[PDB]
């Protein structure tokens, strides 16, 4: 596919996460952090690889925190799952291409970025170091993911390099399904056995 | 003590990082049984290069650099053989163990 991850990154346990929708048939997207609630930090971070119209711009799930006034406050970031089935959430911790950046965009060093539920506990800092340009950023973005389960709360915990999501995918139908991989187009037919070919 | 007389910088850092590939790394400092009469480790990382592809190499300390690169130039069918046997002039089609 030619439209990836348009800022350069990784993406934890990604063969994993194309395996889960094998077996899910929908998604019902669930705003569980507005981008409104950010009042304390800037919300408005783009960039040239994720370039829109000619202007910078970002992610439309995700929010790239960013100072605000030249301060950068603990990012508190908390959602219950009360939307009756499993949720998937997203989010990822920006590494910055060199401590100049680091300074310019979070102020801060030394930042961590973690993600606590009843079954996951992850803390992760960034990682500032030279790299080869890639869409013409030095940086990158690991990206990594949960499923969230019936009842449960998870919490958002960052001093910096947080790209905190704004919906989660909530699984509403489950069954047997799969993953072609071909480069044809969808066709008006119908048919009760599907190949690649 | 050993940090002092070998880096003299505390906290060191190892980074490598390519196109595909970002990585970095800190030495652990612990009390462990000597092997070979050394009580430090080595790890050992690798990495494979792409086609016109750039890797850096950061660090303040604990960095042992490499000197050579291994380009692969015939690639094909092979194998590795779990023996205790020695080479002999002798020519076949197919190989086993015994
Ligand atoms: C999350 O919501 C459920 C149902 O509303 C409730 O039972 C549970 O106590 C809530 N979690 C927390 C941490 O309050
Ligand atoms: C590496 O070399 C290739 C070919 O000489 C060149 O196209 C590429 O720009 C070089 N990489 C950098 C970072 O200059």
Same mark, same amino acid.
């Given at each position: ?8 990154? &990784? ?5 994993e996460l194309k395996?889960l ?48 006034? &030249? ?56 990682? $500032? ?28 915990? &960052? ?11 909530? $699984? ?26």
């Amino acid at each position: 596919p030619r439209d990836g991850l348009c800022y350069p990154g &990784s993406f934890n346990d990604y063969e994993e996460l194309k395996h889960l929708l094998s077996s899910v048939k929908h998604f019902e997207k669930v705003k569980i952090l507005p981008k409104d609630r950010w009042t304390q930090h800037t919300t408005t971070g783009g960039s040239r690889a994720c370039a829109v119209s000619g202007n910078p711009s970002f992610f439309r799930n995700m929010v790239w925190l960013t100072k605000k006034g &030249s301060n950068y406050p603990v990012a508190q970031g908390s959602y219950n799952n009360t939307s009756g089935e499993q949720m998937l959430i997203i989010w990822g911790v920006h590494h910055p291409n060199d401590e100049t950046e680091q300074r310019t965009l979070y102020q801060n060093v030394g930042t961590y970025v973690s993600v606590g539920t009843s079954t996951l506990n992850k803390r992760s800092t960034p990682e $500032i170091a030279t790299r080869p340009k890639v869409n013409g950023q030095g940086g990158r973005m690991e990206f990594s993911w949960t499923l969230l389960d019936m009842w449960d709360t998870i919490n958002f915990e &960052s001093t910096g390099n947080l790209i905190a999501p704004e919906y989660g995918f909530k $699984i509403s139908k489950r069954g047997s399904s799969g993953i072609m991989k071909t480069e044809g187009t969808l066709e008006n037919c119908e048919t009760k056995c599907q190949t690649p070919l």
